[PDB]
Amino acid sequence: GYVPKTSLSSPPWPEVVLPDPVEETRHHAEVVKKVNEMIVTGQYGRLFAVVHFASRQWKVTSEDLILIGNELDLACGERIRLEKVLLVGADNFTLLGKPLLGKDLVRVEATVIEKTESWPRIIMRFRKRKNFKKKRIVTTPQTVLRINSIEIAPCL
Amino acid sequence: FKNKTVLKKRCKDCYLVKRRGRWYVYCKTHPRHKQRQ
Amino acid sequence: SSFSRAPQQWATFARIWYLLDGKMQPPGKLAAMASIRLQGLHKPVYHALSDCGDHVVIMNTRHIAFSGNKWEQKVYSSHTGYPGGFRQVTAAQLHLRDPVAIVKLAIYGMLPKNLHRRTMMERLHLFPDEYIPEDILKNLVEELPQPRKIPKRLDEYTQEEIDAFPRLWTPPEDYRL
Amino acid sequence: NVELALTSDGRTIVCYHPSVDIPYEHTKPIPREEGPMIEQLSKMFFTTKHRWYPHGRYHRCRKNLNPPKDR
Amino acid sequence: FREVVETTIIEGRITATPKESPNPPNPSGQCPICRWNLKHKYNYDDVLLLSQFIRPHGGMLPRKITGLCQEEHRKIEECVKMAHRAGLLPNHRPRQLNRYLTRWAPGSVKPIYKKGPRWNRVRMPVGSPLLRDNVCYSRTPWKLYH
Amino acid sequence: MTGKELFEMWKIINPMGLLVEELKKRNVSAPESRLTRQSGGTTALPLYFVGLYCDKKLIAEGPGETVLVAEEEAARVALRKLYGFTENRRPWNY
RNA sequence: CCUACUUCACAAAGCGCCUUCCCCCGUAAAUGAUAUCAUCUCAACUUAGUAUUAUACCCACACACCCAAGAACAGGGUU
Ligand SMILES: [Zn+2]
Ligand SMILES: [Zn+2]
Numbered sequence: 149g150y151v152p153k154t155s156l157s158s159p160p161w162p163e164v165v166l167p168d169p170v171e172e173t174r175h176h177a178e179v180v181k182k183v184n185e186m187i188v189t190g191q192y193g194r195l196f197a198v199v200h201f202a203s204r205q206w207k208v209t210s211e212d213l214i215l216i217g218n219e220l221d222l223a224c225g226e227r228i229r230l231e232k233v234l235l236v237g238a239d240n241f242t243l244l245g246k247p248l249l250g251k252d253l254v255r256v257e258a259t260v261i262e263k264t265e266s267w268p269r270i271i272m273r274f275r276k277r278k279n280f281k282k283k284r285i286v287t288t289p290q291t292v293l294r295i296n297s298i299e300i301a302p303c304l
Numbered sequence: 305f306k307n308k309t310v311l312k313k314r315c316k317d318c319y320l321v322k323r324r325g326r327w328y329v330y331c332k333t334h335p336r337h338k339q340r341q
Numbered sequence: 342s343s344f345s346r347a348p349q350q351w352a353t354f355a356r357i358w359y360l361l362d363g364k365m366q367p368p369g370k371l372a373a374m375a376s377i378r379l380q381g382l383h384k385p386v387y388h389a390l391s392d393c394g395d396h397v398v399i400m401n402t403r404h405i406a407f408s409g410n411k412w413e414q415k416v417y418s419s420h421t422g423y424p425g426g427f428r429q430v431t432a433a434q435l436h437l438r439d440p441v442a443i444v445k446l447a448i449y450g451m452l453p454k455n456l457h458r459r460t461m462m463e464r465l466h467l468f469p470d471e472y473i474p475e476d477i478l479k480n481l482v483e484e485l486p487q488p489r490k491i492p493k494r495l496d497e498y499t500q501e502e503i504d505a506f507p508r509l510w511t512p513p514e515d516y517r518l
Numbered sequence: 519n520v521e522l523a524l525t526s527d528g529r530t531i532v533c534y535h536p537s538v539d540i541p542y543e544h545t546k547p548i549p550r551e552e553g554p555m556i557e558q559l560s561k562m563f564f565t566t567k568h569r570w571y572p573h574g575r576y577h578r579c580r581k582n583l584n585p586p587k588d589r
Numbered sequence: 590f591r592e593v594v595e596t597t598i599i600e601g602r603i604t605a606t607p608k609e610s611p612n613p614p615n616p617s618g619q620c621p622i623c624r625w626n627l628k629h630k631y632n633y634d635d636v637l638l639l640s641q642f643i644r645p646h647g648g649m650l651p652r653k654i655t656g657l658c659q660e661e662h663r664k665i666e667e668c669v670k671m672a673h674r675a676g677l678l679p680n681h682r683p684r685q686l687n688r689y690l691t692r693w694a695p696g697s698v699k700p701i702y703k704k705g706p707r708w709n710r711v712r713m714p715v716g717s718p719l720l721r722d723n724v725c726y727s728r729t730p731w732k733l734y735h
Numbered sequence: 736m737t738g739k740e741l742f743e744m745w746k747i748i749n750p751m752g753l754l755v756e757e758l759k760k761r762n763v764s765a766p767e768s769r770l771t772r773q774s775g776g777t778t779a780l781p782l783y784f785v786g787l788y789c790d791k792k793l794i795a796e797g798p799g800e801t802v803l804v805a806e807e808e809a810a811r812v813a814l815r816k817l818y819g820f821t822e823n824r825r826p827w828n829y
Numbered sequence: 830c831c832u833a834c835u836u837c838a839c840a841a842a843g844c845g846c847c848u849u850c851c852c853c854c855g856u857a858a859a860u861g862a863u864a865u866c867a868u869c870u871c872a873a874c875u876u877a878g879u880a881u882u883a884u885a886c887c888c889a890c891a892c893a894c895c896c897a898a899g900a901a902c903a904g905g906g907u908u
Contacts, residue, residue, distance in 0.1 A: 149614060150626070151614070151630060152507055153505070153506065154630055154635045154638060155631070155632045155634055155635055156629070156630045156631060156632055156635075156723060156726070157630050160726055175521075176523035176524055176525075177523075178523075179522070179532055179534050180523050180525055180532050183534055190825075192825070193821065193824045193825045193826075194822075194823045194824065194825065194826055209826075211737050211738075211826060240534065240537070241533060241534050241535065242532075243530055243531070244531035244533065245529075246528075246531065296829060297829070304525050304530065304532060305855095305856090319868070321868060321869080323868095323870070324696070324697045324869090324871075325693070325699070325871045326871080342822045343812050343815045343816065343822045343823070344798060344808060344812065345808060345811060346740070348797060348799055348804070348808045351782065351799070352784075355775075355780070355782035355798075356775065357774050357775075358774060365687050396564070396775070406687035408688070408735070409688075409690055409692060409714055409716070409735060410692065410695065411713050412688060413696075413699075414698055414699075414700055415701070416700045416701055416702055429700070429702050430880090433686055456568075460566050463560070476777040480776060480778060482773075482775070492634035492636075492689070493636070494636065494677050494678070495636045495678060495679070498636070498637065502637070506637040506638070507609075508607050508608065508609050508641065509609065509610075509642075510609055510621040510642075511608050511609045513654060514590065514603050514606050515591055515603065516590055516591065516654060516865085517590070517592075517865060518590045518644060518645065518650070518865090539792070539793040540772075540786060540793055540796065542769070544771070545770060545771045545788075546769070548768050548770055548806065549770075551890060551891075553890095562779045563779055563780070564778075589738065644861095644862065644865090646861075646874090647861090647862080647874080648862030648872075648873070649862060649863045649864095651863070651864065652863085652864090653864095662863080666872080667872095670872055670873070673873045674872090678873080681873080683873070683875080684860090684874080684875090693871035694870060694872070694873090696871085697870080697871035714871095
C-alpha cells in the first residue's frame with residue numbers, strides 16, 4: 149500500500165488526525181469551566197447577542213435600537229424578553245447555540261419605544277405601449293425596540 | 305513539397321517525420337517524393 | 342477598540358502595501374491575487390464605493406511563467422486607431438518589449454470594468470526584477486504567498502532525498518545508456 | 519488562537535478567544551499651474567487626474583451640505 | 590551499464606548499475622509503475638521518478654529495457670518532455686521564458702491571431718491529455734485547454 | 736453619556752503626560768512608546784500603530800497618521816483602560 | 830525647397846531642384862533519443878533567426894508694432 153513520495157501521491161491539503169475522545173472531552177470540560185468561571189466572576193464588559201426576532205437575525209447590544217417592520221401588539225414602553233438568542237459574545241468568549249441558546253443562559257430584554265408607520269413607499273407598474281400604468285402608495289407599520297440589557301448566567 | 309491530405313511513402317527511402325508541428329514525407333533519393341500535410 | 346473616532350476610522354480604512362513575487366508564477370494567478378487586493382475584496386469592510394483598495398507591489402514580473410505554449414500562442418492585440426494600425430503581438434514578443442505588460446494586462450482585465458479600474462491600477466506597482474525603489478520598500482507591509490509552488494529541479498534535490506526515493510526498476514547491466 | 523468546546527450536553531458551543539498582545543520583541547523603537555498641480559496630487563495620493571478637476575455649480579449645489587450622521 | 594573507453598584501442602567495461610529498491614509494495618506486476626503503485630500518481634514535475642527512465646543526455650529509454658507498459662511509457666515520455674521544457678532537468682542536457690506544462694515544442698506552435706467566437710474558441714493546450722486519468726484532488730476537473 | 740467617549744466628555748491635554756503621572760501614582764516606570772505596526776510610511780496616508788510597554792508588557796496600542804498622533808492616541812487608550820472607561824466596558828445598569 | 834529655368838516677381842508655384850535608412854521565417858541544416866541505425870526536434874538541444882522597429886524629431890511654467898506665423902486665437906521678432 150506504500151506509495152513513493154510524489155506530487156500526487158498524497159492529497160495537497162494537510163492530513164487531519166482526530167484527537168482522542170478522552171483528551172477532547174478533558175479539554176472541552178476545561179474550556180467550559182474556564183468560561184463559566186469568567187461568567188461567575190463577571191469578567192466581561194459589554195455583551196452582544198445575535199437574536200432571531202420577527203423573521204430576521206439582529207446583532208444586538210445594550211442600548212441598541214431595532215426597527216421591526218410590523219406592529220407588535222405591545223404598548224409603547226412595555227418591556228419584553230427576546231427568547232430566540234442564537235449567539236452571545238463578550239470580549240474574551242462567545243456562546244453558540246445549536247441553533248438556540250437556552251433560556252437559562254441568556255436573557256435579552258427590550259422595550260417598545262415607538263410604534264410608527266414607514267415613509268410612503270411607491271409601487272408603480274408600467275408596461276410600454278399597453279396603456280398599462282398603475283400607482284399605489286403603501287405605508288408599513290413599524291415598531292422601534294430598545295435593547296435594555298443582555299444578561300448571562302453561569303449555567304454551562 | 306506537394307501538399308497532400310494523406311501522406312504516402314513512395315519509395316523505400318521515403319520517411320515520415322513530424323516537423324514544425326506537421327507531418328512530412330522526406331526522401332533523399334527522390335526529392336520528387338517530398339510531401340507536406 | 343477604545344480608539345477615538347478619527348483614529349479608529351483611519352485604522353479601519355488605511356491602505357496596506359502587499360508584495361507579490363512573480364518569479365516562476367503564472368501571471369493569471371498573480372493577477373487574481375493582485376486584483377482582489379487592489380479592489381479591496383480581501384477586507385470585510387469592503388464596499389465598491391468605499392475606496393478600500395490596497396497597494397500591490399509585484400516584483401520579478403520579468404520571470405513570470407506561462408503554462409503550456411502560451412508564450413507562443415497568446416496574442417496581445419492593439420490598434421493605433423489609424424488604418425493599418427492593427428498590431429498583434431505574441432506573449433513572448435510583448436514580454437521582451439515590456440517586461441511588465443503581461444502582468445499589467447492580466448490585472449487590468451481582471452479588475453471590474455468601471456471608472457474605478459484606473460484608480461485601482463494606480464495602486465499597482467510592477468517591477469521587472471528584484472529591484473524595488475526605496476520608498477516603496479519602506480511602504481511594504483506584508484508579502485503574499487506565491488500562488489504556484491515552484492517545483493524543484495534535480496540539481497536542487499538533495500542526495501538524501503534522491504536516496505529516500507526508491508529505485509523503480511533494474512536496468513540490464515549490458516546496456517550502453 | 520481559539521479554544522472550542524461543546525458543553526457536556528452538547529447543546530452550546532463555547533469559544534474562548536482571549537486577545538493576544540503583540541510581543542515586545544516584534545516591535546521597532548519609535549523614530550525620532552492646474553495641470554502640474556493635479557499631476558502632483560495624483561502622484562501623491564495614487565489616484566488619477568479626474569478626481570482633482572473641479573465640478574460645475576449644478577453638481578456642487580446638488581451635494582447635500584447637512585448629511586445625516588449616524589453614531 | 591556498459592561504457593566504451595578509448596585510448597587507437599577501444600573497449601567496453603560494465604560499471605556499477607543500480608538495482609530496484611527492496612520490498613516493492615505490489616510485487617508481481619506488469620510494469621515498474623504497477624509494482625510500486627504509481628499508476629495515476631505522478632506528474633511532469635516528479636523528476637525523481639522521471640529521471641530513472643532517462644538517458645544521461647535527456648533522451649527517453651526504450652520500453653523494452655524499462656519494462657514499462659505502453660501507456661505508462663507514453664505518459665513518462667510526455668512528462669519528461671514537459672519537465673525538460675520546464676527546465677526541471679538542467680543536468681540531462683546534450684552538452685529566456687519560464688514555462689511548465691507545455692504540450693508542444695515551443696518552436697512549432699503558431700500564434701492564435703484569430704481566436705474564434707465564444708462557441709468556437711481556439712484554446713491554448715496546457716499539459717498533456719495522456720495524464721487525464723490521474724488522481725483528481727480538486728472539485729473541478731483540471732483543464733487541458735486554456 | 737451613552738455612546739460618548741471618555742475624552743469626548745473630559746477634554747484633556749498631553750494624555751501621555753497624564754498617563755505618566757498616573758503610572759507614577761501607581762509606582763510604575765514611564766511606559767516605552769514603541770512602533771508595533773506601520774503601513775505606507777513614506778506616503779501621504781500612513782498608518783502607524785504605537786504601543787506603550789510597561790516592562791516589556793503591552794498596556795495599550797493606538798493607531799494614527801503620524802507616529803506622534805499614534806503615540807498620543809495610544810496614551811488615550813491606556814488612560815481609558817486604566818480608568819475602566821473602555822469602549823467595551825460593562826454597560827450602565829438601569 | 831526657390832539657386833537657376835518656367836508661371837512669375839519683394840513672394841507663391843512646377844514644368845524645376847534636393848533628400849529618402851531594417852527585417853519578418855516558407856524552409857535548409859548540426860547533434861540526437863522515443864525506436865541504442867537513422868531522424869532538422871508539436872523530443873530535449875545547436876544555427877541560418879531577425880521587432881524588444883532602430884532611430885531620428887519636439888522639449889525654457891508664469892501695450893503696441895512688425896513677421897518668412899496666422900481665419901480668430903496662438904507663435905516668432907522689436908538691442
Ligand atoms: Zn522516395
Ligand atoms: Zn502495468
